[PDB]
Design a protein around this nucleic acid. Sequence first.
RNA 1: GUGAACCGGAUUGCCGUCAGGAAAUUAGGUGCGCUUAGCAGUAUUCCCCACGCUGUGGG
Lengths: 251, 54, 90, 268, 165
Amino acid sequence: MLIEIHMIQNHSPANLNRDDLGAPKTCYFGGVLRSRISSQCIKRSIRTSNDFKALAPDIALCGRMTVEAALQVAHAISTHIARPEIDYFVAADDVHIGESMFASACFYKYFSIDWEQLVKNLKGDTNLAAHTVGAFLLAAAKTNPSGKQNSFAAHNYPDGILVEFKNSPISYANAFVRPVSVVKESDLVEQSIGQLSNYVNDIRLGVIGFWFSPNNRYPLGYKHSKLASRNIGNLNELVGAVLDYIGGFKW
Amino acid sequence: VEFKNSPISYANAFVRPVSVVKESDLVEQSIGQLSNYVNDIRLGYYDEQSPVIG
Amino acid sequence: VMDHAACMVCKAPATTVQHVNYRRAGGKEIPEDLRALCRLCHDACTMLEYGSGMTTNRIDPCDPIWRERILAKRKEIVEFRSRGQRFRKM
Amino acid sequence: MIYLSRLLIDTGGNPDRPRPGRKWLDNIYNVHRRLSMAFPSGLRREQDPHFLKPFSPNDFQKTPFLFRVDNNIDGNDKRAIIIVQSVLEPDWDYCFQNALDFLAAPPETKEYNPEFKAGQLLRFRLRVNASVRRHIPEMVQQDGQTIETGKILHKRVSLTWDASSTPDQALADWLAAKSPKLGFTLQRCELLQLGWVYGSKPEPKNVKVKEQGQGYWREHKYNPLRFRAALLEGVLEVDDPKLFLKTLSSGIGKAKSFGFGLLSVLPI
Amino acid sequence: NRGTVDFIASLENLKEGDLGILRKLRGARLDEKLPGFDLFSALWWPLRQKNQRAPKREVAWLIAKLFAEFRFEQREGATLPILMGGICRKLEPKKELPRVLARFDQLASLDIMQMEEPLSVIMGILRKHQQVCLDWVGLTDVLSFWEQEPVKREWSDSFIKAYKI
RNA sequence: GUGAACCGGAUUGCCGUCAGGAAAUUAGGUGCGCUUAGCAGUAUUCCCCACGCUGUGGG
Ligand SMILES: [Mg+2]
């Protein structure tokens, strides 16, 4: 059984990951250029952080030197066309013009957890496997890369999570083939979550899922569809729901 | 003003642009949208073991 | 029929209908988004919504907080309107 | 006791402006209803003091009141006068709290305890419903040729005089034929103003069964209301005490729910 | 689209007094003045009863204001990003061309409630450069969907193609 | 369980000092909204109940 986490978050003007020339990392999707944050950034972003440190843990989850790690992280991708910009800065003497650059985008992320490998790596432990899964959930919901954060204080918090228990690993990145155009009667986040809605409404017509949104801000689906099993209003409650669907489990 | 253990930025209250209507002004609607986002985050990601005030 | 053909603010007979919200349009219409008001109240609440930008939820004549604004607007309408301009439509 | 009230309506000024109070007087069902919400239920006035809820007939108390409408009072302004007589205290601040543009003056109320002696000269003003129930055969169609059908109709029509008598004499005879039972005798009675009154009324009618059930869809259908009116003024003398008081606050003619019986009495 | 065409026809059916009354109400909303509201209602509301895709109240009010001010003749094929583009060539490439171009590209940062004065000065430079024809229907149909990228994407494209000729 | 498995491009930076769009313009010349209309001296007043072969009571 695989536990799959769907992740939509908005981010302020900053530069978390850069290449050798310094540019914001960028992939190609849907006929245009996409803003990109590496999966090997979210790893060593969540990993070795203080909030996550709460048989040995953090080895069965993410490996180090035939460890067979049971967590897989994918490349975050923007839901609109990448729009880079370059800032001009000068230096003082208090007694020449350079260039820095930045990008702003809303990213979709995707998390997958293998339960059987996690239990096998726990030497038969089961409460510890669910404990580590919960720990990774609370870490991943509240972790950012430590990029150029002193100058661009990018400390945004998410806007929707849907969790899945499907039979085989499948992402929803193909929902963002068409780039999102902002209309007057909506915003970027609402249209992104609607594009996520009109790809889970399909497939079944053509499994279950727990959904959470903070104080139920941007409800999944723009009708009364049952595209998500339950809609919840807390991060702890969503984690407890995940543990409850795994089995009798208290947080 | 606020006090945390973890940095939380509230810039996303203004993802939707603010359109001036005949009743209010830009300032009141800006702080109202900020209050709405602050209320929603306070009622959202909230842990009893480390409560916050401001 | 339900409102007994009486206005909801001033109780004169009812001719038009205002929409409390626009959640469903055209195909589906539950008769709880609709209230019966007369011409002056319809025009007053219509002019209260020219630049409001509230889109979904519109003005509720049952809620007392709008009554004092609506009556002043109606006083303005009675003070200013020309009947002969409404007739002979140019 | 007996409670009398007065309402004043402008009915004039600039014709080019909206005049809702002037518009309210064209229909007698609307006038009667507007006077009729003046008495809420002990529970209703605690539920909506603002009178901002759907109006239903069942949440208001029932009382057979009487009223008349008069006009032509000068003083460089035009006025319309409604006089309401009732056996309960009217609540004029609840009926018109969102309709102040109807009236050119705030309402007034006062008590009325009329005590009389027998054989007293009294001045009265009354508008009477001149109606007689008659047997009528049935004419249909009249498409250039009259078609007769054997059904005989029992219907309420106006009183008819002959070609050789004045209307005032026949009206006085019709009133003196009835005055012994009420408790009064005439000496003079003249006709002031005779005419008709029109009214229209909502009536629910079934249209289609609901797909989800539990009732119908319904549609309002409107039925005409025609009555005959004749306004009279004169001098009467009393014949019995508890009998003249039996005449008052009960009515003299018919159609009393639409303001067709009201005795306005002055001791001359 | 139908409903627009009758709206523009009813705008052209107006007489001197109606054009003056919509002229005096420039730079304002409708709810303040009652004769303007009544005239706009009598000219607009039957079309909204009959046709569902009749113009919105704000866009119809704005187009009524602009037609009352400028009174251009309706003719197909005289749309705004063509006459802009046919006009821009007759100016000095060093100084006046960026000046006109900035005022033309300022429209992509303004809302329909804020798009009365830039349109006023743009039709002003038309009236200064001796033009009598303008496609009002196309302008109404693009203003009704002004908040979409392909509409302003085909805006300046019609411009570039008229300017390059 | 794949030229695969383990895998942050990170730390530093005020665009700050200088400016009148200015001189001058009548939107004036002509037009009748005109010929018409009792809220009353009648011969069915839309519905319902009760009593007799028109008189009360309710819409
Ligand atoms: Mg009303």
